């Protein structure tokens, strides 16, 4: 199940100021960027053009090139038409299709001031249940534009799935790539008196799915709290798993790492081991300004 998304970020400071930046993700790999400082959509991968020829790309780029300018002015006129709502204004757009055979569900979500309010469904734009009522009038206006509504329908029903099926094969090499995680141990005072928070750092692994647990032999320590996936510049991932122990309970515990790149043979970092000791000695510091 691969999810492809085009993310548009449009800001309006006033009547005379606006910028639009775009980014494009397949799974968790960035394929395209489009800065407000540039009249051309940029490839961030050697395979970002998909299975589309030069002529097919230039026509689609120009299609969007026309859209970026138009969108800006269309919004600015809607503001004047609602002049009820004032500047500054933030608009976000999320659009694309999910892959499953030939089946694919397409979407186009719109948020106004950081809250989801509009989506394109079937043949027209619609307001979300529990949305501002003043949004009806602009929606009524946007629907009277058959050409834009036809273009969107084309892009959602036909273009997205035919293009994304092209990318998935074009970048099969980078998607199936395997990167080995590296782990190192740490500890910090728990927020509770007499307690200690152990930390298992796990960095550099690709793809994303990973398993990290604290173990006493054959028993996974149920107090193991899995962290949030933090990105690295080389599109790999960092994650930490933490365990709260009473001072003294450190010994005999281990951090176990399961990742597809390791291929059976896990990483087992034991607390207090000669390796753990050697890693920690290479890490000492004056502790300013440690976290409160």
């Amino acid at each position, epitope marked *: 199940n691969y999810t492809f998304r085009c993310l548009q970020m449009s800001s309006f400071a006033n009547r005379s100021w606006s910028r639009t930046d775009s980014v494009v993700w397949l799974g968790d790999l960035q394929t395209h960027r489009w800065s407000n400082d540039s009249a051309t959509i940029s490839f961030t991968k050697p395979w970002s053009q998909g299975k589309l020829s030069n002529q097919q790309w230039e026509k689609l780029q120009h299609m969007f090139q026309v859209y970026r300018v138009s969108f800006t002015r269309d919004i600015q006129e809607l503001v004047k038409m609602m002049s009820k709502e004032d500047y500054p204004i933030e608009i976000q757009l999320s659009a694309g299709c999910e892959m499953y055979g030939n089946a694919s569900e397409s979407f186009l979500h719109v948020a106004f001031q950081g809250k989801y309010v509009v989506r394109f469904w079937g043949t027209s734009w619609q307001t979300v249940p529990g949305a501002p009522s003043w949004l009806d009038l602009p929606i009524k*206006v946007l629907n009277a534009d058959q*050409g834009t509504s036809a273009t969107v329908q084309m892009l959602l029903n036909d273009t997205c799935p035919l293009f994304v099926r092209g990318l998935l094969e074009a970048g099969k090499s980078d998607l199936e790539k395997q990167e080995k995680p590296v782990a190192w141990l740490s500890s910090v005072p728990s927020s509770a008196h007499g307690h200690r928070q152990l930390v298992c750092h796990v960095s550099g692994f690709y793809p994303k799915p990973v398993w990290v647990m604290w173990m006493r032999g054959d028993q996974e320590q149920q107090g193991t709290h899995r962290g949030d996936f933090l990105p690295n510049a080389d599109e790999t991932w960092y994650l930490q798993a933490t365990l709260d122990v009473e001072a003294g309970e450190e010994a005999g515990l281990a951090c176990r790492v399961k990742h597809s790149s390791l291929g059976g043979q896990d990483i087992i970092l034991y607390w207090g081991s000669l390796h753990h000791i050697l890693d920690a000695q290479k890490m000492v510091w004056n502790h300013r300004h440690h976290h409160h």
Partner: T-cell receptor, first 113, second 109 residues
Framework: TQVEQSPQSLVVRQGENSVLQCNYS??????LRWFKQDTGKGLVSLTV?????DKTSNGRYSATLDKDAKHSTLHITATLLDDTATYIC?????????????FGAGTQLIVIP | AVTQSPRNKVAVTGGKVTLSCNQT?????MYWYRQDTGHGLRLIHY???????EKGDIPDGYKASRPSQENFSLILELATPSQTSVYFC?????????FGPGTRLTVLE
């Protein structure tokens, strides 16, 4: 100007054919309209063109549109005297209430009897 | 039908001139254009409905007012010889835009 027209003014012998040109750079180009302006009066619409390649007709007037050429031609078959007027080419950038019309200087058609 | 009043006007430099427009078409949008040789129609002010009023491409010298769906005025508080032109008033979603008969304004020193 985003919309130009040729010729400046045209002269035709009553009953013959008259050919008027329009060339633009309006982006995007949703539709193109031709107007007629009787001297001392407002603008009356003759015809509108929607498709990328559109061929429209109304009475003596017939018009063509090519969007990839950004060009249009208004034909008057068998001109009358009462056709002596300014003819203006107008392009609408967007097919919604948010659009904005771009006007040309127009051609001044003069029909000699 | 789009009604204009007056059809002709002679004003002096620094005088107050108001061109009144009207339409019984129940139209949301209205526009004020001026027509000068070798140009084609240029937009001065426009509106999306009662209360609202917006600057066009050449608003300098001109103000606008729309109190009702019917009326739309162009107000020249201090008149200039450079404001001598023919003025047209349009209405409709830019779907068909309908135009007025025009007002000849001459402003003299």
């Amino acid at each position: 100007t985003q919309v130009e027209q040729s010729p400046q003014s045209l002269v035709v012998r009553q009953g013959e054919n008259s050919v008027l040109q329009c060339n633009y750079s309006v982006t995007p180009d949703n539709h193109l309209r031709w107007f007629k302006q009787d001297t001392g009066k407002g603008l009356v619409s003759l015809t509108v063109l929607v498709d990328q390649k559109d061929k429209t007709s109304n009475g003596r007037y017939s018009a063509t549109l090519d969007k990839d050429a950004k060009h249009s031609t208004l034909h008057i078959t068998a001109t009358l005297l009462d056709d002596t007027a300014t003819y203006i080419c107008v392009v609408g950038d967007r097919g919604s209430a948010l659009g904005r019309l771009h006007f040309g200087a127009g051609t001044q058609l003069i029909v000699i009897p | 039908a789009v009604t204009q009043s007056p059809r002709n006007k002679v004003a002096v430099t620094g005088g107050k001139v108001t061109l009144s427009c009207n339409q019984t078409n129940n139209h949301n949008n209205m526009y004020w254009y001026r027509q000068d040789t070798g140009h084609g129609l240029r937009l001065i002010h426009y509106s999306y409905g009662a209360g609202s009023t917006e600057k066009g491409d050449i608003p300098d010298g001109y103000k606008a007012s729309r109190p009702s769906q019917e009326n739309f005025s162009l107000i020249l508080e201090l008149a200039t010889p450079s404001q001598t032109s023919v003025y047209f008033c349009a209405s409709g979603d830019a779907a068909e835009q309908f135009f007025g008969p025009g007002t000849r304004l001459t402003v003299l020193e």
